Amino acid sequence: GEYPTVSEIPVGEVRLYQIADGVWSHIATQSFDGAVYPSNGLIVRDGDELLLIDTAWGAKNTAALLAEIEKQIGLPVTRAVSTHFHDDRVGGVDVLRAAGVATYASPSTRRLAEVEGNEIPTHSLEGLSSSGDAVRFGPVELFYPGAAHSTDNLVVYVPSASVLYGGCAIYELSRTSAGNVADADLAEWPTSIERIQQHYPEAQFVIPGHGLPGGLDLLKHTTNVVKAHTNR
Ligand SMILES: O=C(O)[C@H](CCCn1c(-c2ccccc2)n[nH]c1=S)N(Cc1c[nH]cn1)Cc1c[nH]cn1
Ligand SMILES: [Zn+2]
Ligand SMILES: [Zn+2]
Numbered sequence: 001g002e003y004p005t006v007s008e009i010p011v012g013e014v015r016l017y018q019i020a021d022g023v024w025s026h027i028a029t030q031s032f033d034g035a036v037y038p039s040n041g042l043i044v045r046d047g048d049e050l051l052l053i054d055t056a057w058g059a060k061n062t063a064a065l066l067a068e069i070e071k072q073i074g075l076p077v078t079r080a081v082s083t084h085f086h087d088d089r090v091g092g093v094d095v096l097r098a099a100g101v102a103t104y105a106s107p108s109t110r111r112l113a114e115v116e117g118n119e120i121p122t123h124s125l126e127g128l129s130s131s132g133d134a135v136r137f138g139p140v141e142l143f144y145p146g147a148a149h150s151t152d153n154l155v156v157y158v159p160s161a162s163v164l165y166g167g168c169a170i171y172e173l174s175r176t177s178a179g180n181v182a183d184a185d186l187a188e189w190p191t192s193i194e195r196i197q198q199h200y201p202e203a204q205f206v207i208p209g210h211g212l213p214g215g216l217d218l219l220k221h222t223t224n225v226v227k228a229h230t231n232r
C-alpha cells in the first residue's frame, strides 16, 4: 500500500508496513524540538519467530511496537539488533529485555551507549569491528560500512527480499540537509556509503532511518547531502 507518514501515525502509536514476504518496516513518530519526525525499524521473519531491528524510539513506543506486532503478525520477537548507540535505536532496550527479547549490538555500539548513559543491549556481536566486515545473523546479514552518521553505525541486508536497511547512515530523498551530525564522521561518510554500494549492488528496496523507502539512489542522494554539508 501507501507508506505511512507522520499523518497516519498518532504520536505514541506504531504502524507496520509489509515490504516483502516476511519483511516489514515499523514506523513510529517522535516529537523533538518543536517538530514531529517519523522513524523506521525493520522486522524479519525467522522461521516461526521474529528478529527485530532497532527500537521504536523510547520505552513507550517500544511497548506499543510489541503490542502492534502481537496483533498483526502474532509471532514472538526473540531477538533484537540495535544498529547504533543513539537513543532512537536503543531507547526501549529495557522494555525488550523485560518481554524476554535477547538484545544485541556490536561492542562498539555497547561501549558508546555506556559512555552516553543510554540503555545497553545485552549481547555483543563479534566480527564487525573493521570497515567492510559482514556477519550473518539468522535471516539477515549485518554489515559495518565504516564511520558515517556515527562511528558504530551498522546496515542490515535481507538476502531473501533484497531489502537494504540503511538506518541513520542513509537519508530519504526528501531530506535536503544533513541533520544533527555531531557524532558523525563527515570525512569518511561517503567512502562508507560506497562500501555499501559495492557490497549490495543488487538491493531492490532501501529503507532510510527516517522517512520514505526508495531504491539504491538513496545512497547517492545521501552522498550529495553529506558533501554539500561538508562544503557549507
Ligand atoms: O537528524 C536529526 O538531526 C534529527 C533526527 C534525530 C534522530 N536521532 C537521534 C536522536 C535525536 C533526539 C533524541 C535521541 C536520539 N540520534 N540519532 C538520530 S538519527 N531530525 C531533526 C533535526 C535536528 N537537526 C536537524 N534536523 C532530522 C529529521 C529526520 N527526519 C525528519 N527530520
Ligand atoms: Zn543517531
Ligand atoms: Zn540472552
Ligand SMILES: [Zn+2]
Binding pocket: 088, 167, 168, 209, 210
Ligand atoms: Zn535516526
